[PDB]
Paper text:
In order to shed light on this fundamental mechanism, we studied S. aureus FapR (SaFapR) a transcription factor that senses the levels of malonyl-CoA, a key intermediate in fatty acid biosynthesis, and modulates the expression of genes involved in fatty acid and phospholipid biosynthesis. FapR has been shown to globally repress the expression of the genes from the fap regulon encoding the soluble FASII system as well as two key enzymes that interface this pathway with the synthesis of phospholipid molecules. Like most transcriptional regulators in bacteria, FapR is a homodimeric repressor. Each protomer consists of a N-terminal DNA-binding domain (DBD) harboring a classical helix-turn-helix motif connected through a linker α-helix (αL) to a C-terminal effector-binding domain (EBD).
The crystal structure of full-length SaFapR in the absence of ligands has been obtained in two different crystal forms. Interestingly, in three out of four crystallographically independent protomers the repressor has the same non-productive quaternary arrangement as observed in the structure of malonyl-CoA-bound SaFapR, with helix αL bound to the lateral face of the EBD, strongly suggesting that this compact structure likely represents a conformation of the protein in solution. However, the helix-turn-helix motifs display high temperature factors or even partial disorder, and are engaged in extensive crystal contacts, suggesting the coexistence of alternative conformational states in solution characterized by flexible DBDs. Similarly to other homodimeric proteins studied by single-molecule or NMR relaxation approaches, our crystallographic studies suggest that the two conformational states of SaFapR (i.e. with EBD-bound or EBD-detached DBDs) can be populated in the ligand-free repressor species.
Author numbering:
A (entry chain A), B (entry chain A), C (entry chain A), D (entry chain A), E (entry chain A), F (entry chain A): 6 to 189
The structure:
């Protein structure tokens, strides 16, 4: 048997506090309850929908970055520790897919990744010098790609950044980035 | 001393017949004559401007390709030998540059290259699986990037394609692409 | 009395197999059941909504045509027998109506029809030479117009094509088209 | 020999007073003088370029019409005698041509014509009921099409309007329009 | 206890007849019944949604005004007594808000107000000469602002117009406008 | 008589060093020499055109401001002393004028002014509370409006800012702004 409405809702607040980015689908699977029930529950709880929460959190992050302007950034910058790590979320719309197939275009995922690497480095001048990438799974129209970047090495002239991207906890894309920086 | 008007113009026709894509700047340097003189000369000769000639030639090429639709293609497909080699030209407009610097965004050059590799392979299904790329020189607002792709290996399941890109005969970008294909 | 849920759903699959383009409204009228019930039923059946099915089928058709490029085509090409007959579907949006009245603009329906005639003829060069048309009923904002073209005569230099267009099986527009063609 | 600068310029003012829509090319042919000389002459004379003059005159005309809103009108309404005759000018841009050929799309010329017929009739409700049209010459990218409409018959319920369209005094398109009207 | 369905619906028709612009939220508060119940009720009653009714009424009003063109008007002109008073409604979309905060930009509310003052004056030439304005409350993304303009003085050369703007009967913006007019 | 080419050009560099925003028209009037001569001179001198220089200088200024995002700013921020004074330049395009007349819309000039006041104040939260404005001269299509803002009073809760706007050193618009600020 299932939780009483009240306890389901308490549990839903705890989940979202704990993961500000948890989806309604994830919440429905967790509590084994229709995706519509999740919506009514959030409404009752005064928790805004995922898009909004995502946009609220990201807005604060563009203040921490200096290499690229907010409106140039690809995706939503959900997390950033300058010079250490960062994450973005990007929805795949028809602009981003091949028209015959609905398969996401490679350069879109590369763009999300490259942008994130530029953004996480706290320098005036930050350019990508080299990159090698692997497209591990097809990404489809309407997917949401979470990219996660981290610095793996830092020399005097470069940062080496690894990016891994996911669609529902499935690794879809991996890349290595060699980033140049100077005090200018 | 310089060529008489008549002989300069004869020589200009021969050059363009010989390179349909030669620029007015290249023609001015060749004959050491203002870029405006080149224009008057072409007008007299009934040779259309570079943009037009480029668009006339490319139009015929989209007929030879099957992996990607014409209007999805990045740049102008100036040359194509299906399954062997191909070339595109792409102008760098403000859409393609970082706003602070006028430096072309990495994903734009990668997009030109990735598109070209997809286009040159004559299969129904063609996906990029892996890529490694080097950004050799900064590309600037208003540059024109010529990308040149060639197949270097072909196995039963993949084509390996090398792309090299230029701005006025200067190598600016290099990439290796691992492309998947099947009969579907 | 009405069909049990199970039998209604079986019957709904049979209908859609039989007419890939049947609407939810048509399905609701058939089974005398709310338009929302139809939606839940399709969801259960794993049958995508009308827009999608329409776009899946049409995508395959642009491969058969050569006179006009896919992205220039007006409406969705749902059916094509080159040089014989063809059909398109076109939604009437605010772009297509007079602003004071919501009445569809004449040139929009003519455009759907003219495009279809160009598309169905399998020649490199296909131009419309003459046309006579009758606007039989007002088409309104949000209507969907199904145009149906067929060749009625073929001489050495022309095809004569008749187009008839409908909104819910009501004839709204009729046209005769005199089409030129050559091997060029 | 040619006219002195002064007399050429006097003659140019007289021409434009006499035809507010005469082009610089027409003026150059008339006086056998480069198209650039015509420009310098107009500048000296304080006569604005063709586009402007066209837009100044047309602006006054939308006040006389009631069947269609100004911003819905196709082309520039250069002349109007409500219920009798009217004319528009329309530039053919890339939006209006087939992409492979630069040939103007049929529905564009039909749209100019149909709009003009709706505009010239001074009634609240004016709908096109029937039309037959002939595409007499190919219209190309960058052409300017002058459409000329006149009422040929008027019954109690309809106006019969003939439209003829030109590119440099060459008849390119002809149409007959059966227009419905009522007091509503 | 609450009204029977039938009587609620009768009462809802009377309300909308009486205020063509009453919202579903207002109707839900009145009858203490979910906003969704209001929707089902209107559907049953054949009363179109607020957006439509608003657009139907406003369409008739642009005929009465002469100083500014319909498509230039900011908001929907719901009410107009030329030279006396007028009202508009304007939705606040992301175009109209600061990006960090969702707060409506001042010039948007000023634009609604200034447009309304120009529109209500029945003269060929009508220009704003002076204005003083007070932003009384923050307007937020997705609010709907009702602006209400009235002439308070009229001299030989000017009209003095007061505008007051509201979001759910809360005064949010107030302005005084000094408007110039002549017979030209 | 006029300056030798060499001395004219020396003098032109000195002028632009001295006023980075001086126009070619201003330079032509100064040296009484065609606007085209000015262009050739700048080309020779390696001084970029006005648009570019303006965009280079402004780019550096958005770094100093915190109340409004760069891409939301109306016009180009050519000068800024946070909490003291600032200036913008704004071109008047067809988007900004009444369609019948080419006269700039009031809210456009108010927008330039209001944006500048928000931008110059170095606080997280900065809102306009009150404003009174005078439209002193008609601004026309293609004019360039220079707005100049300065703080005239500062209390604990507000800044009082005066804006004056010009087209070729002619005062066209004046405004007083009451701005709210807090540490949030
Ligand atoms: Zn998750
Ligand atoms: Zn699941
Ligand atoms: Zn397609
Ligand atoms: Zn892209
Ligand atoms: Zn490096
Ligand atoms: Zn070259
Ligand atoms: Zn050179
Ligand atoms: Zn910038
Ligand atoms: Zn891009
Ligand atoms: Zn592979
Ligand atoms: Zn049907
Ligand atoms: Zn029905
Ligand atoms: Zn309207
Ligand atoms: Zn159209
Ligand atoms: Zn023919
Ligand atoms: Zn003529
Ligand atoms: Zn000629
Ligand atoms: Zn094409
Ligand atoms: Zn069209
Ligand atoms: Zn009739
Ligand atoms: Zn109310
Ligand atoms: Zn309430
Ligand atoms: Zn922002
Ligand atoms: Zn605005
Ligand atoms: Zn005044
Ligand atoms: Zn100056
Ligand atoms: Zn001057
Ligand atoms: Zn107008
Ligand atoms: Zn505006
Ligand atoms: Zn205050």
């Amino acid at each position: 048997l299932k939780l009483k409405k009240d306890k389901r809702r308490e549990a839903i607040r705890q989940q979202i506090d704990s993961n500000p980015f948890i989806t309604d689908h994830e919440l429905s699977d967790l509590f084994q309850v229709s995706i519509q029930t999740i919506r009514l529950d959030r409404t009752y709880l005064n928790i805004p929908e995922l898009r909004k929460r995502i946009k609220l959190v990201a807005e604060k992050n563009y203040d921490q970055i200096s290499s690229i302007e907010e409106q140039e950034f690809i995706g939503d910058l959900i997390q950033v520790n300058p010079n250490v790590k960062a994450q973005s979320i990007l929805d795949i719309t028809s602009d981003s897919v091949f028209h015959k197939t609905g398969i996401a275009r490679g350069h879109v995922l590369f763009a999300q990744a490259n942008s994130l690497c530029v953004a996480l480095i706290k320098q005036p001048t930050v350019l990508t010098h080299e990159s090698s990438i692997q497209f591990i799974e097809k990404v489809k129209l309407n997917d949401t790609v979470r990219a996660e970047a981290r610095v793996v090495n830092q020399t005097a002239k470069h940062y080496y950044v690894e990016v891994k991207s996911y669609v529902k906890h499935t690794l879809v894309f991996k890349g290595n980035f060699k980033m140049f920086y100077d005090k200018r």
